[PDB]
Amino acid sequence: MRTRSTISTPNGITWYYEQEGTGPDVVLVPDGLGECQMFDSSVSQIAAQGFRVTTFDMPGMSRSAKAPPETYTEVTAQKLASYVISVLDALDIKHATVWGCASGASTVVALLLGYPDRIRNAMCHELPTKLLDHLSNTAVLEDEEISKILANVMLNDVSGGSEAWQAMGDEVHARLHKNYPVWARGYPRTIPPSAPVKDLEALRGKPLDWTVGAATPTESFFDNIVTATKAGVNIGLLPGMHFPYVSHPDVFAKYVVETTQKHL
Amino acid sequence: MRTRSTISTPNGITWYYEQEGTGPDVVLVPDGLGECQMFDSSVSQIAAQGFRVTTFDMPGMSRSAKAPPETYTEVTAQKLASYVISVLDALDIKHATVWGCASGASTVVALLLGYPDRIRNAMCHELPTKLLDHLSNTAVLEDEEISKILANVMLNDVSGGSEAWQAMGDEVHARLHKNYPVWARGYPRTIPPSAPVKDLEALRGKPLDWTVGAATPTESFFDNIVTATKAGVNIGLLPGMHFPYVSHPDVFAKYVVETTQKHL
Numbered sequence: 230m231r232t233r234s235t236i237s238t239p240n241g242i243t244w245y246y247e248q249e250g251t252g253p254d255v256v257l258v259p260d261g262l263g264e265c266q267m268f269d270s271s272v273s274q275i276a277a278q279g280f281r282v283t284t285f286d287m288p289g290m291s292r293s294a295k296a297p298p299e300t301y302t303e304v305t306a307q308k309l310a311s312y313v314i315s316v317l318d319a320l321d322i323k324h325a326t327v328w329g330c331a332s333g334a335s336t337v338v339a340l341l342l343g344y345p346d347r348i349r350n351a352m353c354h355e356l357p358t359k360l361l362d363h364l365s366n367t368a369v370l371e372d373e374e375i376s377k378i379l380a381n382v383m384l385n386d387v388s389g390g391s392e393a394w395q396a397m398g399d400e401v402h403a404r405l406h407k408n409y410p411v412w413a414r415g416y417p418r419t420i421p422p423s424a425p426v427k428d429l430e431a432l433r434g435k436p437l438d439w440t441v442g443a444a445t446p447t448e449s450f451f452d453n454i455v456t457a458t459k460a461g462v463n464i465g466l467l468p469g470m471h472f473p474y475v476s477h478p479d480v481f482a483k484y485v486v487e488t489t490q491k492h493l
Numbered sequence: 494m495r496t497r498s499t500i501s502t503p504n505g506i507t508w509y510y511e512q513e514g515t516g517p518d519v520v521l522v523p524d525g526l527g528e529c530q531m532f533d534s535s536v537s538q539i540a541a542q543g544f545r546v547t548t549f550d551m552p553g554m555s556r557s558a559k560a561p562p563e564t565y566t567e568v569t570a571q572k573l574a575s576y577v578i579s580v581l582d583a584l585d586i587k588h589a590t591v592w593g594c595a596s597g598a599s600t601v602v603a604l605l606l607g608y609p610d611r612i613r614n615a616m617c618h619e620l621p622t623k624l625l626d627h628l629s630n631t632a633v634l635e636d637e638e639i640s641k642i643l644a645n646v647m648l649n650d651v652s653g654g655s656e657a658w659q660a661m662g663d664e665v666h667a668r669l670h671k672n673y674p675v676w677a678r679g680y681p682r683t684i685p686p687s688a689p690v691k692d693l694e695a696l697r698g699k700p701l702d703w704t705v706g707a708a709t710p711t712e713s714f715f716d717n718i719v720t721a722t723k724a725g726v727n728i729g730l731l732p733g734m735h736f737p738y739v740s741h742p743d744v745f746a747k748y749v750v751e752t753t754q755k756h757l
């Protein structure tokens with residue numbers, strides 16, 4: 230049975246969150262769009278293997294929208310790592326395996342380096358380390374223009390799975406619709422510079438499993454592959470692109486379960 | 494003024510070849526389809542920076558079809574390298590800069606390791622090191638189905654630019670049509686295990702520049718990025734996919750020129 234509820238943290242945030250299962254903690258951190266319904270299938274499938282899975286909407290996004298402005302403007306990996314630790318504190322999760330894509334990826338690595346005592350192991354997928362102009366320039370349009378542009382980028386360019394992306398349903402797309410402008414304004418200018426991978430030695434011998442999408446163009450995350458190799462970090466591929474928990478839920482869960490078991 | 498001629502080597506091959514310019518030798522080795530017209534405008538552009546540029550159809554392909562069966566069956570990088578060195582010998586090219594994509598990449602790296610006195614510097618692009626079943630399963634089909642399958646794969650999947658591909662013209666496309674069957678039977682099963690890149694340390698500190706197509710799916714040549722990094726070899730991107738010299742002649746020619754000038 231899944232817990233769906235909210236919990237507030239001292240930093241001003243009311244987090245919407247979900248929990249299923251018993252066992253060691255696995256925490257699924259959203260990409261920038263902040264929407265945890267994307268993990269819904271996987272939450273069950275990972276739990277069914279003997280884990281306790283927790284996920285949540287990110288500050289300012291979807292049902293965690295009650296939050297002060299600093300938590301969704303000028304966002305950095307260190308801010309987000311701070312927020313996440315706070316919700317693990319409130320939920321009394323002492324030790325956690327963490328997964329994260331994009332700004333979640335930067336976040337999980339930042340958790341790993343910053344809170345080594347809390348983080349049993351981290352999976353990072355497609356960590357953004359470069360300023361992208363076709364993303365930053367979206368922030369100075371109308372909100373409704375940005376929602377139209379980015380709903381299309383997600384759907385046709387980076388879903389990795391158009392049908393699956395669409396099958397998430399109207400409620401999810403209505404929430405994402407409101408997140409697109411918030412994301413555009415708070416994330417793509419400040420997340421890349423914050424990437425905690427500029428120090429290779431801090432990376433080395435850490436329980437970190439990095440992945441990039443099989444179908445993503447080689448240029449988008451080429452730098453991830455070079456970085457993980459220079460630091461001896463395990464680096465591999467998942468099917469799809471930016472959202473393997475959406476396009477390939479079954480392979481995603483198996484991957485989380487199997488990487489988790491390896492570090493238990 | 495391009496020389497367009499034929500020269501025979503004592504291993505039984507009559508090569509169709511092209512030469513333009515005056516200056517240090519730059520040799521452009523085709524991909525597995527073996528067709529040198531794909532280089533046409535880059536030949537001119539590179540030579541106009543002070544280089545003699547030579548290129549050639551590969552044995553058993555296009556206008557170099559007059560060759561004994563061993564040169565186009567069970568093909569390996571060591572075999573191709575040995576053929577290329579035989580045509581360089583015939584053209585009295587003693588010290589060459591070499592470009593190669595795909596099996597041509599395997600070949601240029603095999604050239605660099607095997608003939609360091611002969612090779613000023615080597616540029617390899619998208620070097621195949623993995624068995625791919627869909628390529629391999631085409632050998633068993635009838636010539637015409639192989640041509641249909643592979644013509645489509647090149648057009649829609651890996652060209653990096655379908656207009657540029659189509660614009661090669663009917664003559665080129667009719668020589669490729671004959672080459673697909675020859676290529677399917679001779680190359681995909683035996684080229685990858687011959688990849689000369691399993692000895693990382695022999696690549697270390699060599700004059701080698703490796704590239705991958707910016708738009709190629711990350712999975713296709715992820716392994717190239719790993720190997721070059723482990724080995725210290727310069728790795729970067731060219732725009733497009735498997736045929737940068739068709740889809741982006743200008744960036745391609747400038748890249749060959751710059752990289753060559755680095756090694757003079």
Ligand SMILES: C[C@H]1CCCC(=O)CCC/C=C/c2cc(O)cc(O)c2C(=O)O1
Nearest residue numbers: 260261262331332357387416417420421
């Ligand atoms: C929202 C999602 C949309 C993905 C939209 C997209 O264009 C994929 C390109 C890869 C970059 C994603 C990204 C980059 C950043 O600097 C910060 C981020 O939070 C993201 C990110 O989360 O991407």
Ligand SMILES: C[C@H]1CCCC(=O)CCC/C=C/c2cc(O)cc(O)c2C(=O)O1
Nearest residue numbers: 524525526595596621651680681684685
């Ligand atoms: C002909 C060209 C078609 C390119 C067709 C294509 O599917 C691109 C996939 C990358 C592999 C190319 C390749 C693989 C091998 O094992 C041997 C080869 O000679 C090639 C190669 O040359 O690819």
